[PDB]
């Protein structure tokens, strides 16, 4: 239900300790929670919005030079003086021409010359900064009701959406039939603002960090500035041409729009047209589930004769999904759904739409379950008129251990120490893991910055070669945490 | 003297008439009649498909996208031959002569 | 080489290797730019629509 068919989804179960669990969720993925009760929910972060931005610095992109004036003076007598050097719209440069009697001054030396032209901008590029307050995520919560035609739809108001701010609180979600779920979200430490700048071309906008945005070779201008004429770094958008030793001239230096669309590689695009809608990053959510009902508890079992109305089809991650329809009487009831092996003894393989339900009519209902890694029967009824359905699930024996390992390592490569916040109070394992991971990410962060796709691989191979030829058991520490790790981060970078 | 242009690059362009086309995950690759037109730019990729996408079979279906590439600023690179290349040299003596 | 008003003097093999969409010396309803991929970029966010 809104989770199915979307790739890179993931499962969490275990609400141990109290009645909570830690989940972290990005904008691309969506998270399915499970328990021994407490019906399976689907969480997805759909918006990130910055409400009130304040501009930081306005850069120029396309300029023009009008009122080209120049002035020269005979050699060994000072510098030329010109009234347009006073006003700072005009860009200036001193150079040396050679003069004589043909140049009409005498003394046959190398005179001085100035040139001036006013710097009019006609295309801006403004960056904006936002506080870590006054920003408003939107997370949507969809229970596995198994409702008719509500599966994997990014459309549809089948689930509740709540808006969470750092000025907000425990944020109950009154979603009907199932009770009320509360979320202790941590939105301040989500994507690390007070570094991001939100620069903006004509109709596009990006998300770069502060120390990259400030030191650009474009002529800049501060944010609190009306009458935007006093451009400050004007000499990086003009060229002073003194080809021979004759008089010199000024030129404008084109448009750096497509030049800076080259410069904005590796910087995730956001959508600043109407509202500062981000669609990147994550946030960490503490999820308390003490007040979830089950919506199907205190219903009797079923009479029989179900009917499949849409053929089953496994997804990725090996979870089938079937739509069945009830034919019979006593319509609010459970569904006798179970996956058994051959020869009908063991009930192996679990459900994801746990406690399925027939509701209010003969409306078809969706059931998701996880079969075992071979052939297995599916039993969707009681004994007069069941529905035995064969199913073969490919692989799924040892490849989901290496596949789960690659999902965990990819999560530890994208997320930092926040990747350890995907489980519930390890104590001697989880807190120690993110402590060592945050000091190692601190050391690794104070290196490798500015280093691209290639050079992480290159000096990774260098560190492996220094390891493989060293002695005194520094070789193992010179491979296992630096060499192959920086090669893996060399491959899994620039998403 | 006689320049003949060799090749002209584009500087600033414009994209109109954006069309796209997707298809079911196991059912091969999509195709458009705009794809064989040389004034349209295309690149295959793939999306996620399922019952919410009105598809079935829950996989990764291919997708194409088109756009009519239109230029509006050119850079004509002309070239000349070594003949009809006409220099000009002034000759002047040291006539002791005013100005 | 020629811009709108400015003009340069570059050599051939540098001029032929610039990644930028091109078309031969006769335009005549050109509409046939060759390496068009160097001046567009196709975004596929989230493995959703592109």
């Amino acid at each position, epitope marked *: 239900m809104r989770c199915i068919g979307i790739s890179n989804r993931d499962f969490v179960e275990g609400v141990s300790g109290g009645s909570w669990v830690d989940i972290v969720l990005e904008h691309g993925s969506c998270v399915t929670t499970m328990a021994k009760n407490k019906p399976t929910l689907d969480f997805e972060l759909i918006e990130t919005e910055a409400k009130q931005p304040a501009t930081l610095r306005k850069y120029c992109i396309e300029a023009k030079l009008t009122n080209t004036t120049t002035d020269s003076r005979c050699p060994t007598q000072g510098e030329p003086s010109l009234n347009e050097e006073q006003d700072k719209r005009f860009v200036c440069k001193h150079s040396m021409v050679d003069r004589g009697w043909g140049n009409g001054c005498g003394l046959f030396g190398k005179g001085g010359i100035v040139t001036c032209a006013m710097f009019t901008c006609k295309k801006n590029m403004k960056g904006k900064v936002v506080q870590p307050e006054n920003l408003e995520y939107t997370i949507v919560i969809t229970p596995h009701s198994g409702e008719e*035609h509500a599966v994997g739809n990014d459309t549809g108001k089948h689930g509740k959406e709540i808006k969470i701010t750092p000025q907000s609180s425990i944020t109950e979600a009154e979603l009907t039939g199932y009770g009320t779920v509360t979320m202790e979200c941590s939105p301040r430490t989500g994507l690390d603002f007070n570094e991001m700048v939100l620069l903006q071309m004509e109709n596009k906008a990006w998300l770069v960090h502060r120390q990259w945005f400030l030191d650009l070779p474009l002529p800049w201008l501060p944010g609190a500035d009306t009458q935007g004429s006093n451009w400050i770094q004007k000499e990086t958008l003009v060229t002073f041409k003194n080809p021979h030793a004759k008089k010199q001239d000024v030129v404008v230096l084109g448009s750096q729009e497509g030049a800076m669309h080259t410069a904005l590689t590796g910087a995730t695009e956001i959508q600043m047209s109407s509202g500062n809608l981000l669609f990147t990053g994550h946030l960490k959510c503490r999820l308390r589930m003490d007040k979830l009902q089950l919506k199907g508890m205190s219903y009797s079992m079923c009479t029989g004769k179900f009917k499949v109305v849409k053929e089953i089809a496994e997804t990725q991650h090996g979870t089938i999904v079937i739509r069945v329809q009830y034919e019979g009487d006593g319509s609010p009831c459970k569904i006798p759904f179970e996956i058994m092996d051959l020869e009908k003894r063991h009930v192996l393989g679990r459900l994801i739409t746990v406690n399925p339900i027939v509701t209010e009519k003969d409306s078809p209902v969706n059931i998701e379950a996880e079969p075992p890694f071979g052939d297995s029967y599916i039993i969707i009824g009681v004994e007069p008129g069941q529905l035995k359905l064969n199913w073969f699930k490919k692989g799924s024996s040892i490849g989901q251990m290496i596949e789960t390992t690659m999902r965990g390592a990819k999560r530890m490569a994208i997320l930092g120490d926040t990747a350890w916040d995907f489980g519930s109070l390890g104590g001697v394992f989880t807190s120690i893991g993110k402590a060592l991971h945050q000091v190692f990410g601190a050391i690794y962060g104070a290196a490798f910055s500015g280093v691209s796709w290639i050079m992480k691989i290159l000096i990774g191979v260098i560190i492996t070669w220094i390891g493989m030829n060293s002695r005194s058991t520094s070789l193992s520490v010179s491979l296992v945490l630096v060499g192959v790790v920086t090669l893996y981060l060399g491959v899994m970078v620039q998403a | 003297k006689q320049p003949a242009t060799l090749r002209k690059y584009c500087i600033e362009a414009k994209l109109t008439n954006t069309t796209t086309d997707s298809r079911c995950p196991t059912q091969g690759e999509p195709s458009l009649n705009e794809e064989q037109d040389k004034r349209f730019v295309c690149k295959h990729s793939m999306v996620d498909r399922g019952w919410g996408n*009105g598809c079935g079979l829950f996989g990764k279906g291919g997708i194409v996208t088109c756009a009519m590439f239109t230029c509006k600023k050119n850079m004509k690179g002309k070239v000349v031959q070594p003949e009809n290349l006409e220099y000009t040299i002034v000759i002047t003596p040291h006539s002791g002569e005013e100005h | 080489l020629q811009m709108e008003n400015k003009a340069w003097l570059v050599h051939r093999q540098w001029f032929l290797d610039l990644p930028l969409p091109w078309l031969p010396g006769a335009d005549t309803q050109g509409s046939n730019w060759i390496q068009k991929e160097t001046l567009v970029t196709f975004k596929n966010p989230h493995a959703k*629509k592109q």
Partner: antibody, heavy 127, light 109 residues
């Protein structure tokens, strides 16, 4: 609970620019799309309207690609349908349609249950 | 490219009537977007059947559809006098355009 109403048009001349609006109520307008389908009397339902959103994009129909333009306004919570270059066969009933936009703003995949609630339709004539 | 449902069908009140639409591989045979409508002559048509077989709220659980390849159907059990309407169809394509059916007139007497 969801109501869509239109603006009545009386009579037009061939070659003019007919215009019909759509006042929307019962929902937030910036999160649902708006379509425009037409039906000649006793004939087939011909799709004209294009996929709108909070930004207001289009998706050009094959038959009506270079003769019709649609606009909207979020501040009045309406959508505008303007067909120009009217010929003799353009007289029909003009319908509206509701569809739910994807939650990321950008709308390409339609809702499974597309075309839920429609307007009553206002007829136009050319002569 | 359109849909080819027949001109007009009729039957006795109480039996089953079938209304089929034959489509191509880009509008019906590939995707699960096919919706049904009914149109009274003094009424705007309302949505009558969802994606292939699913049903709107309201209507009384007797309008069953199917897709048997390139053909999409609408089987109506229990004909009544309130079912005299113009039954049109619709589908969403892979191109991005919506197509529609030709049009069937259903009478009971």
């Amino acid at each position: 609970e969801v109501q869509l109403v239109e603006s009545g048009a009386e009579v037009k001349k061939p070659g003019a620019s007919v215009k019909v609006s759509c006042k929307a109520s019962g929902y937030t307008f910036t999160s649902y799309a708006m379509h425009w389908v037409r039906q000649a009397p006793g004939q087939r339902l011909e799709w004209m309207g294009w996929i709108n959103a909070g930004n207001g994009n289009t998706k050009y129909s094959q038959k009506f690609q270079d003769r019709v333009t649609i606009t909207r306004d979020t501040s009045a919570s309406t959508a505008y349908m303007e067909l120009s270059s009217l010929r003799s066969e353009d007289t029909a009933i003009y319908y509206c349609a509701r569809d739910k936009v994807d939650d990321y703003g950008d709308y390409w995949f339609p809702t499974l249950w597309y075309f839920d609630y429609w307007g009553q339709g206002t007829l136009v004539t050319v002569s | 490219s359109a849909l080819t449902q027949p001109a007009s069908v009729s039957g006795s009140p109480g039996q089953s009537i079938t209304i089929s639409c034959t489509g191509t591989s880009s509008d019906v045979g590939g995707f699960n977007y096919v919706s049904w409508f009914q149109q009274h002559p003094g009424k705007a048509p309302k949505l009558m059947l969802y994606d292939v077989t699913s049903r709107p709220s309201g209507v009384s659980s007797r309008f069953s559809g199917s897709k048997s390849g390139n053909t999409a159907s609408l089987t109506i059990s229990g004909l009544q006098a309130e079912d005299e309407a113009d039954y049109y169809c619709s589908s969403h394509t892979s191109r991005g355009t919506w197509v529609f059916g030709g049009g069937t007139k259903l009478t009971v007497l």
